């Protein structure tokens, strides 16, 4: 129940099952699948540890939140430092979405990990801007309505399409859990390295994207505590870095 990665230790429940990605547990890169010929750096604990991002509030109107994965921990400690100093990187994650209410609250979140969450724009002749897609320290939000038709470079954040032109009700193909406040308090998903190449640069490519979408809204009667926060805690796993050199964003 303790998990205990690095100098960090998060708690769950025995009944609460951990969803292990695509049936694959994160592992290091084999010498047969590798191409980068320089000897990689493996920080071990300094990098593979539980970084807890900023908390967000679940409101009766909230549509959902998303994080780009490499660019969520891009500024977190020595993970971020290695990310800056190396040209190539490879990482799995352990993602722990924590939300706790009481028996008198109700609601349900979908916590999904979308590999290659390429998102669309509102102005069809442009691609969204990096700041609009990415918020490392601060999760970006989905919207309740269609975003403006001509808003220049913006992400089509209409929740029922997940910003990818699909049916949100089919996001379940990606590894996921549900936080049903009735029966759930947190969700743990261990994602392996998902990519077409053995290694990729961590600033240019966000291999994965965490999405928290409330399908059944928060609700409660007068008196019940109103402020229901959600805190996400992601931990790199089996991180490798190749091509050390001048560091830069």
């Amino acid at each position: 129940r303790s998990i205990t990665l690095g100098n960090s230790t998060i708690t769950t429940q025995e009944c609460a099952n951990v969803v292990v990605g695509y049936g694959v547990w994160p592992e290091y890169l084999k010498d047969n699948e590798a191409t980068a010929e320089d000897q990689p750096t493996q920080p071990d604990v300094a990098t593979c540890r539980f970084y807890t991002l900023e908390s967000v509030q679940w409101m009766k109107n909230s549509a959902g939140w998303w994080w780009k994965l490499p660019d969520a921990l891009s500024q977190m400690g020595l993970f971020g430092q290695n990310m800056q100093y190396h040209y190539l990187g490879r990482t799995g994650y352990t993602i722990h979405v924590q939300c706790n209410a009481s028996k008198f609250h109700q609601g349900c979140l979908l916590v999904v990990c979308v590999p290659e969450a390429e998102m669309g724009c509102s102005n069809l002749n442009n691609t969204p801007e990096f700041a609009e897609l990415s918020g490392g320290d601060t999760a970006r939000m989905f919207t309740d309505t269609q975003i403006g038709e001509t808003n220049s470079k913006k992400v089509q954040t209409a929740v029922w399409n997940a910003g990818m032109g699909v049916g949100v009700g089919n996001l379940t193909i990606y590894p996921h859990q549900w936080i049903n406040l009735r029966t759930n308090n947190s969700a743990t998903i261990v994602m392996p390295y998902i990519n077409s190449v053995p290694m990729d640069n961590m600033f240019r490519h966000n291999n994965l994207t965490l999405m928290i979408i409330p399908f059944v809204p928060l609700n409660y009667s007068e008196g019940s505590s109103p402020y229901v926060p959600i805190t996400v805690t992601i931990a790199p796993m089996c991180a490798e870095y190749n091509g050390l050199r001048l560091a830069s964003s």
């Binding site: 695509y22 008198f104 009700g169 379940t172 399908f215 409660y220």
Partner: protein, 238 residues
């Protein structure tokens, strides 16, 4: 000069042919293979995955998450239908755009059982019981809980289990059914009723929601590959 006689079908380009062709890149050293996670080998591996069902197709909800929310509430009545849709996995709107329905729309025939997983997203303090019934065709859709009771059904107590799986069986005159609507391959109606009214304590919400998920069972197969009606084009996209 080996004597030979050409048969009809020569100089023919059949879309779905499986002949050998000479390579334009001889001796091309392909990049080696990589063990990428999530290998798919069959489309039923996708069809077997639970995906939320928009039971509440109401015009007002369809452009919102409200489509996936099935409303239930503490009522002063007994035997009040919660929802009812026919068993058209590939035709009716309730399921045609699910994962299962999407895959079905690439094929003409289908056969098998269907898992309808229902998850109660109300308060932890709520209790109640529901009747999930699959009524095969031949008689109209059940009008009363009594009428629904005579067919394959399951009573789901929300008291202990939050999720309950109703597994609709394959009861058909033929081995397969048309993905498109045909009355000769009619399949039935799936209805839900109140078995015991949602009882709630004080200072707890009496109106809650339910989520429905559709998947295919181990005995599900599709046939006669075809193109989907869902995608349409008029000009080469640029």
């Amino acid at each position: 000069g080996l004597p030979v006689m050409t048969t009809p079908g020569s100089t023919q380009f059949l879309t779905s042919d499986d002949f050998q062709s000479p390579s334009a890149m001889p001796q091309f050293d392909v990049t080696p293979e990589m063990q990428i996670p999530g290998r798919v080998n069959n489309l039923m591996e996708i069809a077997e995955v639970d995906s939320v069902v928009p039971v509440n197709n109401t015009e007002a909800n369809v452009n919102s998450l409200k489509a996936y929310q099935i409303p239930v509430q503490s009522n002063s009545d007994n035997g009040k239908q919660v929802f009812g849709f026919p068993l058209q996995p590939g035709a009716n709107g309730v399921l045609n755009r699910t994962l299962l329905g999407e895959i079905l729309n690439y094929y003409t025939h289908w056969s098998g059982s269907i898992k309808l997983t229902f998850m109660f997203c109300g308060s932890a303090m709520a209790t109640g019981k529901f009747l999930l019934a699959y009524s095969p065709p031949g008689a109209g859709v059940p009008k009363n809980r009594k009428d629904a009771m005579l067919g394959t059904h399951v009573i789901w107590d929300v008291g202990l289990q939050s999720s309950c799986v109703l597994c609709v069986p394959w009861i058909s005159q033929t081995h397969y059914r048309y993905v498109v609507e045909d009355e000769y391959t009619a399949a039935g109606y799936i209805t839900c009723w109140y078995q015991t009214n949602i009882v709630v304590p004080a200072d707890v919400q009496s109106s809650c929601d339910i989520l429905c998920f559709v998947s295919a069972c181990n005995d599900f197969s599709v046939r006669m590959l075809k193109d989907t009606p869902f995608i349409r084009q008029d000009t080469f996209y640029q």
